[PDB]
């Protein structure tokens, strides 16, 4: 929440959004990568996962 709600939310709701530099997009793609892998792994086992992967509870 500290990233999307604080930074990217006020921009994309103004009808004339303009991101400053590409260095922000690449940073945001890394943060939004762990959350994608969690739902991808939950979408085939129908809820119960074994063994717990590194994306879920890292070392």
């Amino acid at each position: 929440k500290n990233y999307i709600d604080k930074q990217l939310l006020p921009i994309v709701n103004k009808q004339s959004c303009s991101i400053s530099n590409i260095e922000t997009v690449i940073e945001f793609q890394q943060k939004n990568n762990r959350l994608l892998e969690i739902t991808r792994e939950f979408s085939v086992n129908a809820g119960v996962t074994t063994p717990v992967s590194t994306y879920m509870l890292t070392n």
Partner: antibody, heavy 123, light 105 residues
Framework: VQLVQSGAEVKKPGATVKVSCKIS????????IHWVRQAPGKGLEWMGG????????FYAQKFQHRLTVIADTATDTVYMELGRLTSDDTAVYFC?????????????????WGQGTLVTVSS | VLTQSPGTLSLSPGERATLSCRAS???????LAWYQQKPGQAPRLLIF???SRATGIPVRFSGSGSGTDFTLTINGLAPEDFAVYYC?????????FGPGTKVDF
């Protein structure tokens, strides 16, 4: 998505006028509205406005203590009042929604501007 | 206190046009926009942030500048963009327009 102005009218010096703004398409809890005056053939000048994001009102230094702007959030309307009206304020008034919301990633702005109406200070 | 130049210009259509905006005191690179308006109608917003185009304008328009100098240049000058070009600014939160330049011919 489009702003609508009040009706144009004639006026006499010494009185106080009222200008209204109706919003249809948004909630005004986020829109920032202002007021610009364009003279008949001259440039514009920012007079005052209400932001909504911070719920604050700013008035121009040259117009301070002469006007009061009240915006009803629930009734989605911002009211433009002008006290001590002289004979040289015969100009077209546009509302306009101009403002930059700078964050750590970029910039944000918009523009609707309504349609504007003219007020004439006759004898 | 913003001053525009070269006042009035009357260059032929189809040639690039240069407009300048100077600031008496230093302003941010952001908090600056260019408005072109034909008389009697609602002004449109050309660029915001002094280097970023708006939503729904041709690729021809482009603006740059930093410090107390800001320049707007248009490469293709169609007969549908002859108007007065204002240069809005805001130091902290106060908006102050400019005298305005008019593109003729």
């Amino acid at each position: 998505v489009q702003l609508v102005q009040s009706g144009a009218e004639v006026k006499k010096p010494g009185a106080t006028v009222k200008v209204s703004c109706k919003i249809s398409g948004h909630t005004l809890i986020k829109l920032s509205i202002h007021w610009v005056r364009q003279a008949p053939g001259k440039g514009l000048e920012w007079m005052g406005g209400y932001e909504g994001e911070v719920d604050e009102i700013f008035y121009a230094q040259k117009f301070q203590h002469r006007l009061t702007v009240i915006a009803d959030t629930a009734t989605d309307t911002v009211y433009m009042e002008l006290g001590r009206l002289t004979s040289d304020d015969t100009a077209v008034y546009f509302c306009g929604t101009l403002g930059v919301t700078v964050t750590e990633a970029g910039l944000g702005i918009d523009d609707y501007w309504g349609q504007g109406t003219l007020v004439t200070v006759s004898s | 206190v913003l001053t525009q130049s070269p006042g009035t210009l009357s260059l032929s259509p189809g040639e690039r046009a240069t407009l300048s905006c100077r600031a008496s005191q230093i302003v941010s690179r952001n908090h600056l926009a260019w408005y072109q308006q034909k008389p009697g109608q609602a002004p449109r917003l050309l660029i915001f942030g002094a280097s970023s185009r708006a939503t729904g304008i041709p690729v021809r328009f482009s603006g740059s500048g930093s410090g107390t100098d800001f320049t707007l240049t248009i490469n293709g000058l169609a007969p549908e963009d002859f108007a007065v070009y204002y240069c809005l600014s805001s130091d902290s939160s106060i908006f102050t327009f400019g005298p305005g330049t008019k593109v003729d011919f």
